[PDB]
Design an enzyme around this catalytic site. Sequence first.
Site, PDB file in Angstrom:
ATOM      1  N   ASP A  35       0.834  -1.194   0.000  1.00 58.44           N
ATOM      2  CA  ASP A  35       0.000   0.000   0.000  1.00 58.44           C
ATOM      3  C   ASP A  35       0.871   1.247   0.000  1.00 58.44           C
ATOM      4  O   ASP A  35       1.350   1.672   1.055  1.00 58.44           O
ATOM      5  CB  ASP A  35      -0.894  -0.023   1.232  1.00 58.44           C
ATOM      6  CG  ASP A  35      -1.804   1.176   1.322  1.00 58.44           C
ATOM      7  OD1 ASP A  35      -1.951   1.875   0.312  1.00 58.44           O
ATOM      8  OD2 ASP A  35      -2.408   1.383   2.402  1.00 58.44           O
ATOM      9  N   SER A 199      -0.636  15.539 -12.059  1.00 58.74           N
ATOM     10  CA  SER A 199      -0.854  15.160 -13.439  1.00 58.74           C
ATOM     11  C   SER A 199      -1.102  16.419 -14.268  1.00 58.74           C
ATOM     12  O   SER A 199      -1.650  17.405 -13.784  1.00 58.74           O
ATOM     13  CB  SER A 199      -2.050  14.214 -13.514  1.00 58.74           C
ATOM     14  OG  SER A 199      -2.429  13.945 -14.856  1.00 58.74           O
TER      15      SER A 199
END
Length: 330
Positions: A35, A199
């Site tokens: 994770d 992004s």
Amino acid sequence: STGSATTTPIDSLDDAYITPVQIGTPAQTLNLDFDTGSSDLWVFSSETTASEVDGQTIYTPSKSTTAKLLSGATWSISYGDGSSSSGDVYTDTVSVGGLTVTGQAVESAKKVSSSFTEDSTIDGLLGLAFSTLNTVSPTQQKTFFDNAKASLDSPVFTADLGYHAPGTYNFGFIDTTAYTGSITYTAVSTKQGFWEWTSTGYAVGSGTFKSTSIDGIADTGTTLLYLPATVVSAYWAQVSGAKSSSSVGGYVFPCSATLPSFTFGVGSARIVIPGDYIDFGPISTGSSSCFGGIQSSAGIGINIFGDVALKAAFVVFNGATTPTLGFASK
Ligand SMILES: O=C(CN1CCCCC1)Nc1ccc2c(c1)OCO2
């Protein structure tokens, strides 16, 4: 040193991925959910409340000659999805894919929430976010990666998750045969303890690319792709019959649909998520309403590049003094 381990979907939907991890002496192999959105290595154990164990493999520290109770240490974690676990702490030898760390904090669960109990395939989590998020008290502990870092050939790990197929976690090296083209690196903020990056925009299907900054986290421990409501609406508008269902808890679409791809930007590069990756199947057995793999992050407080996004790429988690992320197509 290096390590390399195969990671395997837990089910036919890629709801999560499990990676075998050796703990203790002799080894006890548990299948952990790696994770990159958390920083605790915790396991089902001989200390876990019996009614909360249902098919998981447990760690038994009393059977490990290298286990030592970390005196006074406790842990308690609450994940953003509302699941949780807590317990006490041992140090022991932990190996992943041939890479060994001695003295790793292994957090033994005394309690786990129902979602963990109900998933027989996940024996615990191995956190790979920054150690500043580790929950051990009163002395915070380091992640497996941080402990290994200095020994690794290069201070990196890579995630290469498969679509409906196994993939690989590598530590200490970048497998140049595992991706196509070049890896584009992008800046990371560690201020919130995550692999947080921005992004450069998105496209839906064969549509034009929209240049827009989307700040989010690279999170192998989250199944879906959670993006701003504007982006998500633009995606699902291209699927006939798709709608946001408050009763189901997100966007659903007719199972008869063909889903468009979704592209996200990494600098000037582009990662394309095929439409199929965005199908999470019937909302309940036999239903013709299917659950979407792109969902709104509104109300979460952060955008999350979960497995739906990451599995479309070869992803480098660069833990150099100034961390960065790398993405390549594959
Ligand atoms: O809780 C999760 C995923 N969850 C992690 C623990 C194992 C089962 C899956 N992710 C998540 C990631 C970031 C968040 C968030 C939730 O809510 C707020 O920010």
